[PDB]
Amino acid sequence: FEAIFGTFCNRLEWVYFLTSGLAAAAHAIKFHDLNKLTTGKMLFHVQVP
Amino acid sequence: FEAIFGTFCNRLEWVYFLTSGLAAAAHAIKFHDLNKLTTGKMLFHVQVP
Numbered sequence A, B: 001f002e003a004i005f006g007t008f009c010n011r012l013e014w015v016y017f018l019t020s021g022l023a024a025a026a027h028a029i030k031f032h033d034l035n036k037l038t039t040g041k042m043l044f045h046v047q048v049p
Helices: B021-025
Strands: A040-045 B003-009
16 A cells, blocks of 8 residues: 655746846847847947047 | 947046146136246345344
């Protein structure tokens, strides 16, 4: 005579990017045409004193 | 497609002479006939205790 008494699930611990401290380093933006963008560029015009 | 996310230019740190601490050591005067002035001098007279 065997008996099972128990069926238990390990509670998964959940992490989210925006709640982390590391997200402070980021400017997180959603852009739904990322698969079409090849390369994004930013360009700067400085004249010295 | 490529994207130009932004175009940037620098703004100089505008630094006036009379808005500095080094100006504390100076007594700053504007003189319009300066280019006529060859040499300016001061005279001191001292008697001793």
